[PDB]
Nucleic acid binder design. Sequence first.
DNA 1: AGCGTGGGCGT
DNA 2: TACGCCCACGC
Length: 90
Amino acid sequence: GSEKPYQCDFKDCERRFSRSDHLKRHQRRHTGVKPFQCKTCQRKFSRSDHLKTHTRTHTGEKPFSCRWPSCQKKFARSDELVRHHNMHQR
DNA sequence: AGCGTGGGCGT
DNA sequence: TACGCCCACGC
Ligand SMILES: [Ca+2]
Ligand SMILES: [Zn+2]
Ligand SMILES: [Zn+2]
Ligand SMILES: [Zn+2]
């Protein structure tokens, strides 16, 4: 039970948000607006944070390293590493 | 497996 | 406002 006065008025959408920007971000799912552009491949994206991880597909940057002993696996995204770590154990 | 992308939060 | 982090789901 929170204060989320920013309601999405799109048809049949009953989502609400705590700050105006989070609502505007969500609304791009309805409109398909993609304000951000990768300058390497020209692809456009709805979100700068998703643009940022996309660009690691060009640079090869892999900031997330497996902690398992003798494993040298690295990943671009933290969720990729979570999935890998779940694999060592089961 | 690698990564688009939606929603939850943050400084 | 800018600019994310993490998680989850779905190809
Ligand atoms: Ca509504
Ligand atoms: Zn909506
Ligand atoms: Zn690109
Ligand atoms: Zn590993």
